[PDB]
C-alpha cells in the first residue's frame, strides 16, 4: 500500500535547464548571428564534399584531411563571402546568401575585415579561374606546427595549385602572381580577427548565440590549437 516507485521517480527527475536567454541582447543581432552560424554549418558540410572532390586530397592521411578542413574553414567561408560580395558589383556589401545581403556598433571593426576580401578582389579584378586556384590554396595554407602525416604528398598537391594559379594568369604575369599571393597571405590576418570574434561568441553565455553541431565541433577542436599557437601559417612572401 506504500508508493515505492514514486521515490525512484523523484531521484531520476531531470534538473531544470536554462534556455540561455538575455533580454538585453538585441533580437535582430541574435537572429543575424545565429542564422549566419546555421548557414555556415551547411556551407561547411558542402566544403567537406568539395575538399574530397579536389584531385589529390583523398590520398592524404585521413587525419591530414580533417586537419586542413579544421584549420582553413574560416578562410574558405570568408574568401567565398568576399567573392559573392564582389560578384554583386558592390565591394560595399556582404552577400552571405542571396536572401541575406548586408548593406551598411560592436561589429564595425569585424565588418572592415570581411569587406577587405571583397574590395581586394574588386581592385585586383580577379577572374573566376584565379579565384578557384586561390580558394584551393587556402585549404592548403595552414598546417599543424608539428607537421602533417603525408607532408610529402601535401607539398606535391600545394605545388600543383601554385603552378595552376600561374597557368591561369599566363597569357606583368609575375607582377599579378605577387599581388594574388599577397592577398592569400593577408587572409591569415582576416581569419585571425574573424576567429577571435567567433570564439568569443561561442563562449559568451549572456548572448548565447546558437551554432550548428558541425561548426561547434570544429570550433571546439581548434580553440586549444589557436591558443597554443600550434598553427604553422604557410606564406608566399616574407
Amino acid at each position: 500500500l506504500t508508493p515505492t516507485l514514486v521515490s525512484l521517480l523523484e531521484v531520476i527527475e531531470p534538473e531544470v535547464l536554462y534556455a540561455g536567454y538575455d533580454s538585453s541582447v538585441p533580437d535582430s543581432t541574435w537572429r543575424i548571428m545565429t542564422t549566419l552560424n546555421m548557414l555556415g554549418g551547411r556551407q561547411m558540410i558542402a566544403a567537406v564534399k568539395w575538399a574530397k572532390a579536389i584531385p589529390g586530397f583523398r590520398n592524404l592521411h585521413l587525419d591530414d584531411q580533417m586537419t586542413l578542413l579544421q584549420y582553413s574553414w574560416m578562410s574558405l567561408m570568408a574568401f567565398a563571402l568576399g567573392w559573392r560580395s564582389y560578384r554583386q558589383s558592390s565591394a560595399n556589401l556582404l552577400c552571405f546568401a542571396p536572401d541575406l545581403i548586408i548593406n551598411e556598433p560592436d561589429m564595425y571593426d569585424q565588418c572592415k575585415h570581411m569587406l577587405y576580401v571583397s574590395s581586394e578582389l574588386h581592385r585586383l579584378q580577379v577572374s573566376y579561374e584565379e579565384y578557384l586556384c586561390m580558394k584551393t590554396l587556402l585549404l592548403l595554407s595552414s598546417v599543424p606546427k608539428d607537421g602533417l602525416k603525408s607532408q610529402e604528398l601535401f607539398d606535391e598537391i600545394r605545388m600543383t595549385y601554385i603552378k595552376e594559379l600561374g597557368k591561369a594568369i599566363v597569357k606583368q604575369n609575375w607582377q599579378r602572381f605577387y599581388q594574388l599571393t599577397k592577398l592569400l597571405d593577408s587572409m591569415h590576418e582576416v581569419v585571425e580577427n574573424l576567429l577571435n570574434y567567433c570564439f568569443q561568441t561561442f563562449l559568451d553565455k549572456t548572448m548565447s548565440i546558437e551554432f550548428p553541431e558541425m561548426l561547434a565541433e570544429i570550433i571546439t577542436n581548434q580553440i586549444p590549437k589557436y591558443s597554443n599557437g600550434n598553427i604553422k601559417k604557410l606564406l608566399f612572401h616574407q
Binding site: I45, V48, L62, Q65, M66, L69, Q70, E213, E217, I218
Partner: peptide, 10 residues
C-alpha cells in the same frame, strides 16, 4: 571529431 570524420568517410 565525430561529424567531420563521418563526412570524410561518407
Amino acid at each position: 571529431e565525430n561529424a567531420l570524420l563521418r563526412y570524410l568517410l561518407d
